[PDB]
């Protein structure tokens with residue numbers, strides 16, 4: 414049922430870049446690009462929450478061909494134009510200290526020109542799939558590029574064109590995105606996210622943790638864990654619903670604080686969060702993808 418590995422590293426799909434647009438507005442930190450690829454000519458299909466591999470050109474420091482890097486799909490199964498012909502990624506340029514270094518695949522992607530051919534593999538992953546049940550509740554805890562699978566979910570749920578194309582999925586549950594980025598300009602897809610909340614105030618809640626513009630009660634910069642702590646009781650109450658799914662995505666590091674906050678909330682009703690969570694993971698309702 415779920416498509417997987419229609420293309421593999423030994424014989425990847427050669428797609429063409431259609432467009433490559435900036436998601437970080439002026440005054441933001443770093444570079445994050447929305448890149449859309451043409452899938453026509455092959456049979457690459459995918460669903461929300463999956464990933465694809467991109468094989469960058471060139472060789473590594475040892476002269477070995479570069480290997481694929483995985484990127485979370487940022488478009489629904491239908492693509493951004495709802496035509497079933499494309500796929501999009503949300504790619505941050507990796508750059509860092511000394512160990513000024515630019516990540517190989519991410520720099521290649523963020524600077525890639527439309528018309529360029531790209532080696533694509535996948536799709537892969539069954540850990541971040543959205544439930545078919547339209548009355549499910551969906552909690553989304555994302556930082557930076559972790560917004561990507563969340564975009565696939567929220568677009569499928571809330572875009573007019575998606576609703577028209579998906580007769581079998583008219584979402585009527587409640588979705589809540591807690592999104593941590595350093596600055597307002599760094600809020601990826603800000604305009605569309607807020608548009609979704611204005612149109613579906615009863616079905617979508619949007620919460621930001623903006624570290625350079627907000628302080629937590631302890632006076633430190635505001636991070637996603639802080640927002641989870643702030644709304645821990647509410648989040649725990651939603652999670653107790655048999656139909657609630659929680660999704661965590663972004664660079665590793667946020668899970669510890671999220672657990673600590675949810676643990677304190679659950680403890681109030683005599684529940685051991687770490688145990689409850691184990692059962693949620695077994696049931697396929699606690700979805701994590703960090704990197």
Ligand SMILES: Cc1cc2nc3c(=O)[nH]c(=O)nc-3n(C[C@H](O)[C@H](O)[C@H](O)COP(=O)(O)OP(=O)(O)OC[C@H]3O[C@@H](n4cnc5c(N)ncnc54)[C@H](O)[C@@H]3O)c2cc1C
Nearest residue numbers: 482483484485503504505507509512516517518519558704
């Ligand atoms: C399931 C999954 C989903 C992903 N989704 C996304 C996504 O949606 N968007 C996205 O941008 N990326 C995503 N990634 C990460 C992506 O796959 C690449 O790992 C990332 O883009 C960097 O790859 P690169 O080739 O550009 O860097 P590389 O040239 O491969 O360099 C990576 C290496 O740099 C070193 N390094 C990294 N950070 C530091 C640091 N700060 N200080 C010192 N050394 C460091 C480490 O050795 C690391 O192994 C995802 C990864 C996985 C596994």
